[PDB]
Design a protein around this ligand. Sequence first.
Ligand code: NAD
Ligand code: NAD
Lengths: 342, 342
Amino acid sequence: HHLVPRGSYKVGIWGFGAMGSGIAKNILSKKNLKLVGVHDFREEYIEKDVGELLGLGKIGIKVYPDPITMVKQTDPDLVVIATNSFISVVKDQIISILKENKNVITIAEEMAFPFSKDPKAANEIDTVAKDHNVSVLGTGVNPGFVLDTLIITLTGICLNVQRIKAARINDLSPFGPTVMETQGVGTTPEEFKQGIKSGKIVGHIGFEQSIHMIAKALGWEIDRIEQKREPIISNVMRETKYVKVQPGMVAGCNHTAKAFYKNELLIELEHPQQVLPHLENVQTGDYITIQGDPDISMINPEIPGGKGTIAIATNMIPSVVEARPGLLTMVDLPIPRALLAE
Amino acid sequence: HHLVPRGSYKVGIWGFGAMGSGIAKNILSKKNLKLVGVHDFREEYIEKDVGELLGLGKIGIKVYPDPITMVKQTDPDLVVIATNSFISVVKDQIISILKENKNVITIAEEMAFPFSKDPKAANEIDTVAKDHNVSVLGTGVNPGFVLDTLIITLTGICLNVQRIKAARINDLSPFGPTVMETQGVGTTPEEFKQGIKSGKIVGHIGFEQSIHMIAKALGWEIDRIEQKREPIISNVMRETKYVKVQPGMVAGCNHTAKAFYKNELLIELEHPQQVLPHLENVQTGDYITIQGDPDISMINPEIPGGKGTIAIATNMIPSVVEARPGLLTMVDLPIPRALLAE
Ligand SMILES: NC(=O)c1ccc[n+]([C@@H]2O[C@H](COP(=O)([O-])OP(=O)(O)OC[C@H]3O[C@@H](n4cnc5c(N)ncnc54)[C@H](O)[C@@H]3O)[C@@H](O)[C@H]2O)c1
Ligand SMILES: NC(=O)c1ccc[n+]([C@@H]2O[C@H](COP(=O)([O-])OP(=O)(O)OC[C@H]3O[C@@H](n4cnc5c(N)ncnc54)[C@H](O)[C@@H]3O)[C@@H](O)[C@H]2O)c1
């Protein structure tokens, strides 16, 4: 009732890495968004022109050494935070922006649905947001879309849902050595085991967030989540510039999650990640099965993680600016849609 | 800012046919909805107990001969109108409810997005809704989901969209003689031609609504829509209790639509409807292709029209009750999701 609608929105960015620089380039293309400032803590970006960093020539938008200075001088309506995955780090970044009376989108995986896993941090964020009449959303391809929002959306044509099973199968081949390491690519089984114990081999971050969003959306409770991270052993040679997988070595990580209530399995999410999956007849894609009334079976190849994340983080901007105050989720907002290029 | 949120919602129904009786049964199953009244103009329903009509025993909810009496005595928060397809008929039904200060959902095909095709009727509805601080939504499987909402949602992971192509392929075999007639099943080509001219053979109602919703959502303009309705000629026998199709006869209707702007094709929607499509290797399903950055290719079998429509019309109820006043569309509301059974 009191919302003043706007026709264009100013955007700032905190974190000018792969995602945040993609986002900046995407915003620059939009008719109804304007990029007004960027911040990153690395000297290689600080005080440089964002246009020139992106290879577009000078556009007169600089990278600020400080995010609060950025916000105060450039006056964005919303800041996109593309920094870290973990609510223990990102919470203070989010709160810093909300205290300067701006909205936030983050792609941090633990922010897609933090209410069950990190209830104190969630409440702290929601409270600051409400106290400053601003909104926060965590989004992304996964978590934020393929294994949560999209699943939920499909249930909208169901009379009732019994259980969900979904899988995202990607190809790690495009990526660099850090990604290869986090999925154990190019390891022996023993090496993989020790990387899992040490945390060097991560698998996927977000299944708990997606499970809890789906559950909340459908009115279910979840009392237990079992996760497994198992090496994907190759029978063939798989090689990129940065990794060599021989037969018997690990080609990546099969991370799966099962969510229960009182020992009834309600949600099963699977995310095998490996290099060159087609070499052993694995087809990449996003696959959703809903068992209910009716049953639904649904994308090949899979939605690209990087490009899709850049996209959705951009595309949600107007909705978040226009949204009610608080810590919001994708389930609270109008359906995602692509914003018009200039 | 002024919205008082509710935890349960009372529902009324106008039109107790295949959809409206399905909807009533679905609402009766929900934890957070209560069915409070039904109206239909046929004597066979009027004054009968809805529970008994549905085979559930007496539940003490009757069918009213008058919808306004229904609303005044049973005090629903929202009325679902499942009567007719055409905005020329349904507009006055919708307006009648809005003037009694209640919200509306309708499944009328021309109400999914009436702003371009029927701008005077749309504005009249939007104006009455706003004047009475209530909301109206048109929804359904098609239009309302598969060839509009769902497509739009998928674009939310795109950087930009060039063009869309989508098809829904169903099987008419389950249906009765009226459906068979509207799709020309069991006709000769000459007969089909004359049924198209007379309006006995309809094809699909809604492509213009879906095209215009997708366009509006993406910020596109459409200046021309070309439609074709061509008979699907069988090479084999196809038979149900109510129809016999011999080789050379028509098995149904291939209705397609192409939407342009300045002669560039932006949206192509296809809905072949025929009996027993598998007999000539046609696979039923809903298929969406987005050409853009990135390209996206997406359900087999197709989302069931009847069950899915019952579902979505029910599932949107809380959102519409909670929504801002006016004539809304699926693009304005939170993502569809299944409501919890009691
Ligand atoms: N939800 C999803 O689907 C999704 C998808 C992609 C990435 N992510 C997450 O988004 C984050 C960003 O991914 P990326 O690929 O852009 O990573 P990146 O390493 O390429 O970029 C991170 C950037 O943030 C900067 N940065 C980090 N901490 C900072 C701080 N405290 N202050 C200022 N600048 C800081 C770094 O200097 C770097 O430029 C990661 O946590 C990633 O896992 C989520
Ligand atoms: N958007 C979609 O995907 C979608 C899907 C299914 C049906 N529909 C539409 O929904 C409508 C209902 O479909 P159905 O299969 O239930 O049709 P139906 O013929 O089985 O039921 C219509 C009912 O409405 C009653 N009725 C009609 N006009 C009335 C009036 N003026 N006052 C009171 N009662 C009245 C009839 O007596 C009948 O019981 C149709 O127009 C149909 O095309 C849309």
